[PDB]
């Protein structure tokens, strides 16, 4: 049945409130249920969704969108509720800001007048830069140019909501009940039963129903156990797709029976990295026992040669092999914060341009290759030479060796313990345990969140280094680089740093240089090739200074599938461009072969690079 997608869901959905929530387990559902202004085609271009047309002013400050006449709201049973109107986009922003949406930073500094609204005693919302010119016309006025603004509209904080429905539901809006939202997307939510089932049905009156091929989507809850049985459901025809997991027991027969069908998904939008804490104050989780050890570690992590030595000794493949497969460990490798083909810079990839700038920082970077799916960094001799320089500098400063580094893990993630033990093993093998000792702090999930992700302030980060990630949310290198800026970077805290109190240490680390590189790049909003080259300078600075050490992406997982490759909508950012968007997806009767996938990927790489060209000039025609 090529009209029924049957699979599983393994996360715990918590809310359908697409305006206030941006958690992946929730957006994977509501992207099928609610449309925004734009969506993505299968090549990554922004294309019409609820908006059939759009324009931008010459100064880049005013975006206007024309809603299509048959954009409609439906209740979950499929009955028409009301046409979508431009005021619904005003309602959405006011509601998202008044209730402090998880995604508010996407718009707070972007829409004109919004930051003042969130701080006036009675700041009137009619001063905010979102307006319904008439029923079919929504107009956004921005506080500064944002060449990436349209890509933001694929995030659900920018989706519309009908005010009368919103007001009538009140506290019952956007729960886990299908009737707690209205539907404007390709599907209706026919069922949601917590920890058992999600079912979508194609909306036959959706404006783009003729483009929707999958009529039924059935997802069964997968609780993480008994991995050996979803392949059996693939063979029987009960499932359209089946993951192939190293943590399983039937692997042998699976890999070999499906050796010519196992395909790997594209690397997705989460950039994982290791980072240092260079301003540690919290020592509730340490194997160090003396003030002198803590002083030695604090001085070491401030030494750039020391951080680079760790960087060159961190074997990313061995870490990836523990969580994923050792065969497929290389599929997820990532060497930059900004994925190396995230944008093109003229004839070159972003990663090629970053490499050209990075070589200027030192002979240790000569020949560096930052491409995906290989480890750019690991190099024993480079690590040992860097450490020897660091040890001379640090000994001269009064430090005692070996340097002990604490890293915390959630002990309930088996991939996390085995992964960090691999990092300990490799670092100590390469640099020597008379030089460095990695002390893994196994913690409960609650304690692990308290030392890092949920640490109340920068001063509460309780580790010397950590493994962490960033999800990009708009189509510009700054989405990955801005969080680490020294004026107001949201993620300065992961380094233990606060912009005001640690201004001196921030300057001494060179982060003012990084921050000025980002400002200079953001200034370029007419020539994107020049804009992106300037962001490459900042990415190269970050790599050289090794406060962040890029490691891997998400995605890149093995499966057998009946999904015809490269037909679904696709994007690097937003929620309309991942494997959870069934609208453009097509199913086939026969299992995809590795050979078919290779030919489809080459065809897609040709057509995508070309269509992105035709799409840009296309956007030059929308400048009004
Ligand atoms: Mg039900």
The residues near 410 (Cβ < 8 Å, ≥ 6 apart) are 416, 443, 444, 445, 448
How far away, in angstroms, is 178 Cα from ligand 1 center? 8
Annotated binding site for Mg(2+): 191
Contact 498, 492 (CB under 8 A): yes
For residue 553, give both structure tokens.
């992406």
State the binding site for Zn(2+).
43, 215-216, 285, 304, 404, 447, 488, 533, 544, 618, 622
Distance 172 CA to ligand 1 centre (A): 17
Q: Buried (b) or exposed (e) across 470-504, using 16+ Cβ within 10 A?
A: bebbbbbbbbbbbbbbbeebeebbbbbbbbeebee
Which residue carries 């590189």 as its tokens?
Answer: 517
Question: 193 alpha carbon to ligand 1 midpoint, in Å?
Answer: 6
Please, is 526 exposed, middle or buried when counting C-beta atoms within 10 Å of its C-beta (0-12, 13-18, 19+)? exposed
Tokens, residue 77 = 């049973």
Give the up-direction half-sphere exposure of residue 207: CA atoms within 13 A in the CB hemisphere.
Answer: 20
First to last CA, the chain: 47
CATH 3.10.105.10 residue ranges of the chain are 267-555
- C-alpha to C-alpha distance for 539 and 8, rounded to whole angstroms: 38
Strands 216-221 vs 4-9: parallel, antiparallel or unpaired: parallel
Distance 191 CA to ligand 1 centre (A): 4
Find the 80 Cα to ligand 1 centroid distance in Å.
20
* Ion ligand 1: residues, Cβ under 5 Å: 191
Q: Residue 515 is encoded by which pair of tokens?
A: 């921050």
Resolution, Å (one decimal): 1.8
Fold of 4-221+562-620: D-Maltodextrin-Binding Protein; domain 2 (3.40.190)
Separation of CA 199 and ligand 1 centre (Å): 9
Å from CA of 7 to ligand 1 middle: 17
Q: How far is CA 569 from CA 41, 42, 253, 398, in A?
A: 5, 4, 33, 57
State the CB neighbour count (10 A cutoff) for residue 203: 21
Query: Contact 431/309 with Cβ under 8 angstroms?
Result: yes
Residues 197, 220: contact at Cβ < 8 Å? yes
Q: What is the DSSP code (8-state) at residue 180?
A: G
Give the Å distance between the CA of 221 and the centre of ligand 1. 14
Strands 403-410 and 436-443: what pairing? parallel
Q: Is 169 helix (H, G, I), strand (E, B) or coil?
A: helix
Preceding peptide of 359 cis, ω within 30°: no
Vertex 268 angle, CA 265 and 274, to 5°:
120
CB atoms within 10 A of CB 100: 10
Q: Where in the chain is CATH 3.40.190.10?
A: 4-221+562-620
C-alpha distances in angstroms, 108 versus 58, 268, 546?
23, 26, 30
> Within 13 Å and on the Cβ side, how many CA atoms surround 40?
32
CB atoms inside a 10 Å sphere around CB 333: 23
* 267-555 carries CATH number 3.10.20.30: no
| Residue 351, token pair as written in the block | 């990663």
Strand order in the sheet with 130-134: 51-56, 62-67, 137-141, 130-134
CA 200 vs CA 74, 520, 580: distances in Å: 14, 47, 12
Pairing between strand 46-48 and 38-40?
antiparallel
Distance in angstroms (rounded) separating the CA atoms of residues 572 and 596? 23
Look up residue 331 and give its two tokens. 């599929």
Q: Which two tokens stand for residue 485?
A: 């800026």
């Amino acid at each position: 049945d090529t009209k029924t997608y049957s699979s599983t869901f393994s996360g715990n959905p918590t809310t359908f409130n697409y305006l206030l929530d941006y958690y992946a387990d929730n957006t994977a559902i509501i992207t099928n249920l609610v449309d925004g202004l734009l969506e993505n085609d299968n090549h990554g271009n922004l294309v019409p969704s609820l908006a059939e047309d759009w324009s931008v002013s010459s100064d880049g400050l005013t975006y206007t969108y024309k809603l299509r006449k048959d954009a409609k709201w439906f209740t979950a049973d499929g009955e028409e509720y009301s046409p979508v109107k431009a005021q619904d986009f005003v309602t959405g922003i006011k509601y998202a800001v008044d209730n402090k949406s998880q995604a508010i930073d996407l718009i707070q500094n972007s829409i004109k007048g919004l930051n003042d609204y969130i701080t006036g005693a009675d700041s009137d919302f009619s001063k905010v830069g979102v307006k319904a010119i008439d029923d079919q016309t929504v107009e956004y006025t921005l506080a500064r140019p944002e060449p990436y603004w349209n890509s933001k509209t694929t995030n659900s904080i920018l989706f519309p909501v009908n005010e009368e429905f919103l007001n009538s539901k009140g506290k019952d809006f956007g729960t886990l009940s299908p009737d707690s939202i209205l539907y404007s997307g390709p599907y209706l939510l026919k069922d949601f039963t917590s920890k058992s089932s999600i079912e979508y049905v194609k909306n036959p009156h959706y404006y783009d129903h003729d483009k929707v091929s999958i009529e039924h989507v059935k997802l069964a809850y997968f609780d993480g156990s008994d991995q050996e049985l979803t392949i059996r459901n693939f063979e029987s025809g009960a499932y359209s797709i089946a993951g192939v997991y190293p943590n399983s027991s039937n692997f042998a027969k699976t890999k070999e029976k499906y050796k010519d069908n196992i395909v790997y998904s594209l690397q997705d939008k989460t950039s994982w990295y290791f980072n240092f804490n260079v301003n540690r104050k919290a020592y509730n989780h340490t194997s160090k026992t003396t003030d002198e050890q803590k002083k030695s570690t604090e001085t070491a992590v401030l030494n750039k040669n020391f951080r680079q030595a760790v960087n060159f000794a961190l074997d990313r493949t061995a870490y990836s092999a523990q969580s994923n497969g050792e065969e497929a460990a290389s599929k997820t490798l990532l060497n930059t914060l900004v994925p190396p083909t995230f944008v093109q810079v003229g004839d070159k990839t972003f990663g090629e341009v970053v490499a050209s700038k990075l070589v200027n920082y030192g002979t240790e970077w000569s020949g560096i290759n930052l491409a995906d799916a290989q480890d750019a960094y690991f190099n024993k001799e480079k690590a040992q030479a860097k450490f020897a320089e660091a040890k001379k500098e640090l000994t001269s400063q009064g430090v005692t060796f070996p340097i002990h580094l604490d890293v915390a893990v959630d002990q309930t993630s088996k991939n996390a313990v085995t992964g960090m033990n691999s990092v300990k093993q490799t670092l100590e093998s390469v640099l020597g345990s008379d030089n460095i000792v990695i002390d893994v702090q196994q913690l409960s999930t609650d304690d692990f969140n308290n030392v890092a992700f949920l640490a109340p302030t920068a001063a509460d980060r309780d580790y010397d280094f950590n493994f962490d990630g960033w999800v990009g949310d708009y189509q510009d290198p700054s989405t990955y680089l801005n969080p680490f800026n020294a004026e107001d970077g949201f993620y300065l805290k992961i380094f233990g740093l606060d912009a005001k109190e640690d201004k001196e240490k921030i300057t001494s680390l060179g982060l003012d240089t990084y921050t000025k590189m980002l400002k200079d790049a953001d200034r370029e909003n007419k020539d994107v090739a020049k804009r992106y080259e300037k962001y490459a300078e900042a990415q190269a600075w970050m790599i050289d200074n090794s406060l962040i050490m890029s490691a891997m992406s998400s995605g890149g997982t093995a499966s057998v599938t009946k999904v015809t490759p490269f037909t679904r909508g696709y994007s690097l950012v937003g929620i309309k461009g991942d494997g959870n968007n069934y609208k453009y997806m097509k199913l086939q009767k026969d299992t995809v072969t590795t050979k078919q996938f290779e030919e489809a990927k080459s065809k897609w790489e040709q057509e995508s690079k070309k269509a992105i060209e035709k799409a840009q000039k296309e956007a030059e025609k929308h400048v009004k």
